[PDB]
């Protein structure tokens, strides 16, 4: 299983800095990365970055190098293999050209070559 509910689809105007939430269930939040993906209309879908809910290690594209803050808070043990988590997303020098739908997707495997691969996605959020 696994669910990733995202925040609301409210809108702002250029110059601001919005926070996007992603709440997880049905799986151990620490065991898989959390990816942030952007599907703009005036560009192809872009991978923004992933972060480790276990090790805190983050990795984002150089196009978002000094403009994005990725944070996650510690999980909550529900069962032996189930926990609830949350991931956060921020933008710095923000304009209106960053308009589109934003998704959060967790990693694929816990090890191997496709560890962090965005596998299970959220329902997305509309922006400005």
């Amino acid at each position: 299983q696994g669910q990733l509910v995202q925040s609301g689809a409210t809108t702002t105007k250029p110059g601001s800095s919005v926070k996007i939430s992603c709440k997880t269930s049905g799986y151990r939040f620490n065991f898989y990365h959390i990816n942030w993906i952007r599907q703009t209309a005036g560009r192809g879908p872009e991978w923004m970055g992933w972060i480790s809910p276990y090790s805190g290690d983050k990795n984002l594209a150089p196009a978002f190098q000094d403009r994005v803050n990725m944070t996650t808070d510690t999980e909550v043990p529900v069962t032996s293999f189930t926990s609830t988590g949350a991931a956060y997303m921020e933008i710095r020098n923000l304009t209106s050209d960053d308009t589109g739908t934003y998704f959060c997707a967790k990693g694929l495997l816990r090890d191997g070559s496709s560890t962090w691969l965005p596998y299970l996605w959220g329902q997305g959020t509309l922006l400005t």
Binding site: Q39, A105, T115
Partner: protein, 105 residues
Amino acid sequence: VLTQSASVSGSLGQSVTISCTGPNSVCCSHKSISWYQWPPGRAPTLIIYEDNERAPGISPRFSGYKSYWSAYLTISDLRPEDETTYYCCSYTHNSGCVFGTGTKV
């Protein structure tokens, strides 16, 4: 930079072959290719990763193949729900997943 097929079509029962290629920067023999089925403005779906490994539950008619210069995605035995837009992706184990241009099928 990762170019996909412009567009293509088929019919119920036949097959499709999407392309994905690029320069030495993002392709291919030292990179892995993942194929995402992505309806426009909806929750995407991982179809195939590591060039040809299908995700859990993906129909066997989906098949990936990677040459030394271009990765492929075959979609045999078409069905109504195949009318989506597909995007390829190039990645290594510790980096990002550079997406592709797109392919309307």
